[PDB]
């Protein structure tokens, strides 16, 4: 009963950052040596637990959240960080536990014509509390006159599209990010390493 890491990691299409997916991992054995062939150029800087000793430990409940962001914005996925992605798209709790992984996916998510399918929220009334998805598409009123559904000046659509430019540096390239949220609760252990 190996954990379903491959389907989460080797998925052809990842969710947009604003409407990020959420998956539950339970009742399986989780192995970490495989997360080298499925994810090249991965970066497993992470919080709450030492990565070297993840092999001999049991996790009570695991959540996997996957999305696609820009290269330079990957530093925004961390507890206590402030920015566009952290405030309006994906906010992590300060006392976060679990590990984040990010890997370059230029070869998978870059098109010659231009990728216009990955979207991110740009306007929002107030910052997101930790772990909350805002799928609203209501027009944003940035002025004084009500928009009333019109998208003129001082009335902007809250969601913008990622204009990936691989010709520039890795800060303008699509990076796929998968966040694992661990915990330790009253329930007996059910997810353990090899």
């Amino acid at each position, epitope marked *: 009963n190996l954990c379903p890491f491959d389907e989460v990691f080797n*998925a*052809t*299409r*990842f*969710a*947009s950052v*604003y*409407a*990020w*997916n*959420r998956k539950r991992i339970s009742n399986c054995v989780a192995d970490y040596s495989v997360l080298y062939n499925l994810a090249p150029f991965f970066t497993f800087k992470c919080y709450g637990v030492s990565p070297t000793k993840l092999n001999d430990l049991c996790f009570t409940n695991v959540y996997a959240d996957s999305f696609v962001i820009r290269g330079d914005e990957v530093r925004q996925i961390a507890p206590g960080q402030t920015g566009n992605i952290a405030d309006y798209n994906y906010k992590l709790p300060d006392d976060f536990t679990g590990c984040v992984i990010a890997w370059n996916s230029n070869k998978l998510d870059s*098109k*010659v*014509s231009g990728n*216009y*399918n*990955y*979207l991110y929220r740009l306007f929002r009334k107030s910052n997101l509390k930790p772990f909350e*998805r805002d*799928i609203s*598409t209501e027009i944003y009123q940035a002025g004084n006159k009500p928009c009333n559904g019109v998208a003129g000046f001082n009335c902007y659509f809250p*969601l913008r599209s990622y204009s990936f430019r691989p010709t520039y540096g890795v800060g303008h390239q699509p990076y796929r990010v998968v966040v694992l949220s661990f915990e330790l609760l009253h329930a007996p252990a059910t997810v353990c390493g090899p």
Partner: antibody
Amino acid sequence: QSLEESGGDLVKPGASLTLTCTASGFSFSSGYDMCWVRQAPGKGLEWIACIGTGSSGNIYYASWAKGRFTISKTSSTTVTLQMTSLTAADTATYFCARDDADYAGPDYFNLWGPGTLVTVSS
Amino acid sequence: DIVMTQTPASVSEPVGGTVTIKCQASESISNWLAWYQQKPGQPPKLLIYAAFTLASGVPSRFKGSGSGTQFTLTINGVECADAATYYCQQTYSSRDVDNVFGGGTEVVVKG
């Protein structure tokens, strides 16, 4: 540019047919994905298959047609789909649509062909 | 893996109204969705790609909304030329799926 389809005619039950999709105004470059779908006379759209026109085709099939159908690219502007053992419920209009992104599957269908009618009856 | 249903089967309003069509998926499909329009005796025409973006040459009356598992398409004004059938396509995971397209919704504009 167009994708007029051919090979649509009456076939007796328990037979086989091989329809052909021919591009006009362009050839099958590796940047696009091709797909075949079908529609019953009074029902909704049903997806059949997809083949990628790149170096390594990602041929994909629907569950309901796992082994009955077979899609293959045969030239620079021709992709054929062959079915075997057509039944009474296989009568439909078949469309050869083109994708817009090569994500190993049918993405948004920007361009559609006129489609051809295939009927199965004694 | 992912199966969608489209509702209602058929709708009808006078020329002045607005129609709303719902398409809901078994699991979250994020932003991957497409609304197609097919008039009788014609191949379907793309209307809404990426669940929000209008297609090319489409009139600015079809608004897509929602994300995740529930999606809605709204026509703010019908003009007796929108009497067609509308479909939703998941375009998210097509490895082992019976049908990417959902059911057909037939729109009747009783002018």
